[PDB]
Structure 1
């Protein structure tokens, strides 16, 4: 498998490791080689993809986990399907969206997140899963215009039957820019699974905003920005995010022009219902999915 793939191009490098476009059996694949600082993320994703068999059209397509020893150290590989169009974060800067394309993006993210959050029953049914690092760089754009959620390294699992919560054991913390207020002020009830779903909805509202801005209406579109681009610096600190999200209770501004498009208006209301400081007032993934499905 791993000693079977031709690494062709590094498409990503960072504290997590590196991502490569590889050839495998005459087809493109994505190959993540994890950094040593991030081994636990590899164990977690291997668990979710292999043991839990996490699979959905809006979840990055798993192919294989592997380990390879070279140079007196062992590399941890995650091989998945390859998406030429890359991350939603990159995609959103290369094009504007029309209504159909916008809804397709946000509905597909919502369908992947709903798949994560909803437990499947029966003898080996998927636990409920909270993602905990949802963001546009963690979403790939597929050729058919739908998206898929990637990076399960921080996933948390719950099973109602046993009421067992599996928070894993990963020193990695989520992307500060997308952290819910109850994460930033350290009130989040870490032994309650719902807490982690609600954190996901907060980040989902922020992704929603990111995409909505790129939908054209009345020949108007907003430039691509990351959430809180205007009030925090690149690579924001905890205190940067706390002052904005908690101290000043700020949320991303709704452009006035959105109220001129029935789709953007529905989405504006949707994302604001993801941003309540009170975590339990936020919409659920399924409710978001259902609402996005009634829009046109």
Structure 2
């Protein structure tokens, strides 16, 4: 039999330190091709090792197609393609209503709970370790999927803006898998804040801002972040207008329970999921 490995690279939809993401075509089908830089080659190996250990298949987890190494060395990760792009891009120039806001955040919680839970007979527990709005893609059915398991760990390293206090102050209990779950929940709390801001209530909505936009520069340093999160113990602002909306009022409670300095006190993904199904 023939094995069609020909993947046409049609347009570049991302270019960073990680390398490049291309919209590609394989047998008429849209695929996403991440071409890794030498800088980021370790992320190809860790993600490939993860998918070689457990083939994750979930609505809210970016769909794996292939890992390819070709002879210098070329490292490609091939996934399902989501034309609407990242949540980060989508929130820039889209507002939400109650239904579309809750659909996004419950799909993210569902993806994250699925990563975090050990399923027997099954999958190991997985912590993502780089959860942010850029690593969440928007699907046409209004649900989201979590992308980029390049830093993931199965039972410091992530984007500085989203790092939990225990990462920034190096108190993270590195011997405890639960520590990495708790770091994901912190970041989930920030993403929730970024989404809730874009949900309209009483004709009011906040403009898109990244977490801590008002207290750190662009490309905050480790020290910038540690002073805000660890020393001053600052948390993102909850606007007054949220307290006139029952949904944003319940989401405010939820995000604050993801932001405790004490990691053990934070909600679990499974608890967040239960709470989000009782909202509306």
State the TM bucket, normalised to the shorter chain.
Answer: over 0.9
Distance 1:43 1:157 in 2: 14
1:148 counterpart SS class: strand
Distance 2:197 2:4 in 1: 40
Contact 1:201-1:285 at 8 Å conserved across structures:
yes
- What is the alpha-carbon root mean square deviation over aligned residues? 1.2
Is the aligned partner of 1:155 residue 2:139?
Answer: no
Contact 1:42-1:78 at 8 Å conserved across structures:
yes
Q: Give the deviation of 1:152 after TM superposition.
A: 0.3
Distance 1:138 1:112 in 2: 12
Contact 1:208-1:271 at 8 Å conserved across structures:
yes
Relative to 1, partners in 2 of residues 1:2 and 1:263: Cα closer, same or farther, differing over 3 Å?
farther
Q: Give the deviation of 1:3 after TM superposition.
A: 4.8
2:73 counterpart SS class: strand
State the match for 1:230 in structure 2. Answer: 214
Deviation track 1:204-223 (CA, whole Å, cap 9, x = no partner) reads: 00000000000000010000
Instruction: Give aligned pairs, total.
Output: 278
State the match for 1:67 in structure 2. Answer: 69
Q: Give the deviation of 1:74 after TM superposition.
A: 1.1
Deviating runs (4+, > 6 A) in structure 1? Answer: none
Is the aligned partner of 1:255 residue 2:239?
Answer: yes
Q: Structure 1: which 5+ residue stretches go unaligned? A: 159-171
1:3 counterpart SS class: coil
Q: Structure 2: which 5+ residue stretches go unaligned? A: none
Deviation track 1:33-54 (CA, whole Å, cap 9, x = no partner) reads: 1111111110111122232111
Distance 1:80 1:192 in 2: 31
Deviation track 1:92-144 (CA, whole Å, cap 9, x = no partner) reads: 0121000000000000000000000000001xx20000000000000000010
Contact 1:2-1:67 at 8 Å conserved across structures:
no
Distance 2:235 2:259 in 1: 7
1:77 counterpart SS class: strand
Contact 1:2-1:66 at 8 Å conserved across structures:
no
Relative to 1, partners in 2 of residues 1:2 and 1:285: Cα closer, same or farther, differing over 3 Å?
farther
Deviation track 1:142-175 (CA, whole Å, cap 9, x = no partner) reads: 01010000010111111xxxxxxxxxxxxx8210
Contact 1:108-1:147 at 8 Å conserved across structures:
yes
Per mean C-alpha deviation after superposition, the further-off stretch among 149-158 and 205-214 is 149-158
Deviation track 1:63-116 (CA, whole Å, cap 9, x = no partner) reads: 111112xxx711111000000010000000121000000000000000000000
Is the aligned partner of 1:11 residue 2:13?
Answer: yes
Contact 1:116-1:131 at 8 Å conserved across structures:
yes
2:205 counterpart SS class: coil
Give the TM-score, by structure 2 length. Answer: 0.97
Relative to 1, partners in 2 of residues 1:3 and 1:143: Cα closer, same or farther, differing over 3 Å?
same
Distance 1:9 1:94 in 2: 22
Relative to 1, partners in 2 of residues 1:2 and 1:259: Cα closer, same or farther, differing over 3 Å?
farther
State the match for 2:261 in structure 1. Answer: 277
Distance 2:51 2:238 in 1: 37
Relative to 1, partners in 2 of residues 1:98 and 1:2: Cα closer, same or farther, differing over 3 Å?
farther
